[model samples]
Target: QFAFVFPGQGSQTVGMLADMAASYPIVEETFAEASAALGYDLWALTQQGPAEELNKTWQTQPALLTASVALYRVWQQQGGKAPAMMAGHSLGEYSALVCAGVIDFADAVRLVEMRGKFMQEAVPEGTGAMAAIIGLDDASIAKACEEAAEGQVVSPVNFNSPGQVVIAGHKEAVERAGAACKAAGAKRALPLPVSVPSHCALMKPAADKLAVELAKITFNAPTVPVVNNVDVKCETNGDAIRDALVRQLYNPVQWTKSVEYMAAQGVEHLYEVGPGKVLTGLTKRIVDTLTASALNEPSAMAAALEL
Candidate 1:
């Protein structure tokens, strides 16, 4: 009847899971685990933010992963109903990988830290960029990006919801594409706060590096089906999951398709099992037949459990 979706980057906040961590020591416990593995006090970082330090791609990835994993752990401790299926957006996919019993929690934390590191080192800072194109048809946005490329790299990277798409590539190309989308009648084409042009051709080097690291880890068949963002398909084979993660580094996040797959499977409700209500809002615009909610705070968790 319901599925769980973990959030990706951009949903992270400095003081995420503060109240939850208070009521549930399991929240801080997981952060402690991650901090030990990461060789830093992750719990303190989340409790207080230097804003600039926490926003680093390397910092953001494991931060969100730890938060989502901790929340899932709390859900288990509280005897929450098991979700029918699970999926995560971009880096959040590793969260799903961990929660679905496919990967060890420590291994997942290390893996995502390396993932963010490789992605950051793939392109120099300021050379890559991303933007959102609102109120535009997917086809038109695609076409706009194609024409705006002009030999540079730029393409639709996130098909998040109907009439809302995000693109990424070279800084100049990203700006050009945003302008082109605006000229094509898009309501707004705003730049995102990210420097790494994720899920685009520019990330091929990152994917290559990630593949080497992924080969070192072992993956098991998931306890629950996990819809992948790159192909928008469910993968059970470990090799297939690894390959999907590799390809996901350089491919668009098919969030729209992933949601539709779960929605079509008769999943009537979706819980955003992470720090924020981002996926919850996207779910509202994504499917008419499905309802969604966030499970970040203890209050939200209690309410969702009652349903």
Candidate 2:
């Protein structure tokens, strides 16, 4: 059996779906629908340059979601097999839900737009930050965070894979933690270029606001089980999925464990069904036995169909 994975924020770029959009009308149709929901020209923003605006959290969220789901629709048109399991990192989870029929695409696009807005509003620019700590065990990283926090909100957020844990919180605290991790013999502890510290306690307010939005929408059980980032478990129940998403805003992503869980389930082939190779690269480190490939462009899509 195979698993389908989607990427999160950093995967987006201008002209991300350019090739596929030309080949498939569904790409433009998906962006058009999202444009109606967002009240802005999402397709133009994604296609044209003005990297600054497109990189904003709010714009990036919907754009990535649209690209992912649009590519997924193209995959469907190509007669791709339904995956045995699905998972996405951060914002990509909404795309996975859309594919699994757990959430409507329009709702997801709007929800993530709100999600990004809430997150950006929750933390002041330059006040919050995220850092990637490499070459440290989880316990050591946790210890480093605790030591550097000094009563601040700094903590481990994305447990991406072995030796690749990401931390986020107050800028000072995050910088301190990065220093501490390096001092503790971590290979690298580099700060990310994110304005909002996601997947950390600083995102509590965002989560609270997101909970209100989530409550207004109806969630259905997924057709395929989704390995949620919060729990690293394959979930199909709507309530469970909703709760996990809420918690995910302020919790560390259990990405490493999620991959291990899928590996244990005999998922030998993993397809990254969106832009970029972020998840594909991470999966390589997380599970050596499983083969992973990206199916973002038409060539990759064609290759995936052959599989």
Candidate 3:
């Protein structure tokens, strides 16, 4: 069996969907739907080179979601087979939900727009931060965070792979933790260029606000199981999926475990069905035997259809 996965924040780029949009009219229609919900020309924003505006968390969220689902649509139109399972990294989960029929595409675009706004407002710019710690085990990274907290919020937020983890919290606390990791023999501890400290205790308020918005939407049982980031469990029930999404906001993204679970379930083929190859690279590290590829361009799409 195969699994379909989507990328999140960092995968977006200007003109990401330009080639696909030119070849497939559905790409334009998908962005049109998102523009209606967003009250701006998302298609134009993506094709044009206004880097600053497109990079904002608010714009990046929906833009990536639209691009991902649009690509999914192209795959569908090309007679591609749906995967047996699906998972996404961070904001990509919303895109996965739409693919699984758990959430409406329109509702998802709007919800993520609000989700981005809530996350951006949860912490003031420059006060909260995230950092990538390379060449360290999870335990060592956790200990470093504890030692660096100093009464502030700091924790390992993204267990991305075996020797790579991302931590997030208050700027000072994260900086302290990064230094601690470096001192503890890490090869590199670098700060990420993001305003909000996502997937940490500081995002509790954002999660709470997102819950209110989630409650207002109607969730449906997924046609295919979705592996959630919080627990690394596959959920098909609507309410369970909703709860997982709410908790995911303030919890570590268990990406390593999610891939492990899928591999254990006999999934040999994994497809990164979105803009960048970030998830595809992670899959290679998490499970060496699993065959993975990205279906971002026309040639890739044609090749994936042959599978």
Candidate 4:
């Protein structure tokens, strides 16, 4: 009847879940585990942020994953009921991996840190880009990307909701595509301040590099089903899930369809098991049948738990 959704990159913030950390020791204990894996004062950085440093892709990936797992542990500590299934957006898939019992928390933190480095290293700075096209249909957005490709890669990578799609690829291609989207009667085409043009074909080398670590890491079958971002399908098989994780590095995040699949499977409520409510917002837009809430704070934890 219920499912959990973990957030990806954009959900992270300085001092996130601070109140939760104060009320629940598991919050920081989880971060301490991540600190041990990262070999740095990650919890300190999270609490006392220079913000710019925390926002770096390499740091952002692991920080957000640790925070999600912390909140998840807090939920478990409080005797909250486990959902029938789970799904995550982009890097949050690693969060889902950890919470679903498919991967070790330490292994994922290290691997995603490397994954961030590999993704950034895969493309030269200023050469790759991503943009959000607002108020456009998927077909029109796809046509705009195709119209602007001109021998470069650009496609709608994040199907976040009905009218919002984030496209990623070469910088020139994205710029051209953004303009084309605006020209094709979009409400707006906005560029995001991100260095890594994630979830695109240009990220293939990153996926290849990540597979090395993926191969080294152990994966157990999830206790609950995990709807992978790549194929938007629930995978119980560890090897198939492993393969999806590899492909996920260079594929679109099917957030829209993922929610649809969950709704179709009779998930009536969704709890965002992370630091922010972005995933909850998207789920509201994706399916009217699915009401949702966030477990990011101590108040929300009990507030949502009572329901």
Q: How far is each candidate from the true structure, as Cα RMSD in Å? A: 0.9, 1.0, 0.9, 0.9
Q: Regarding lDDT, does 1 or 3 come out ahead?
A: 1
Per-candidate TM-score against the hidden true structure: 0.98, 0.97, 0.98, 0.98
How would you order the candidates by lDDT, starting with the best? 1, 3, 4, 2
Global CA lDDT of candidate 4, please?
0.90
Which residue pairs in candidate 3 have backbone atoms (N, alpha carbon, C) closer than 3 angstroms, thus clashing? none
What C-alpha lDDT do the candidate models reach, one value each? Answer: 0.92, 0.90, 0.91, 0.90
Model 4: per-residue Cα lDDT over 38-134, one tens digit each? 9998899988988988898899999999998998898888888888999999988999989999999999999999998998799778989889999
Candidate 1, poorest ten consecutive residues by summed lDDT: 46-55
Candidate 4, position 122, lDDT: 92
Candidate 1's C-alpha runs over 4 A off are none
Write down the worst ten-residue block by lDDT for model 3.
298-307
| Residue 286, model 2: Cα distance from true site in angstroms | 0.8
Candidate 1 local lDDT, 78-121, one digit each (tens): 88877999999998899999999999999999999999899889
Backbone clash numbers for all candidates listed: 0, 0, 0, 0
- CA lDDT of 107 in candidate 2? 95
TM-score of 2: 0.97
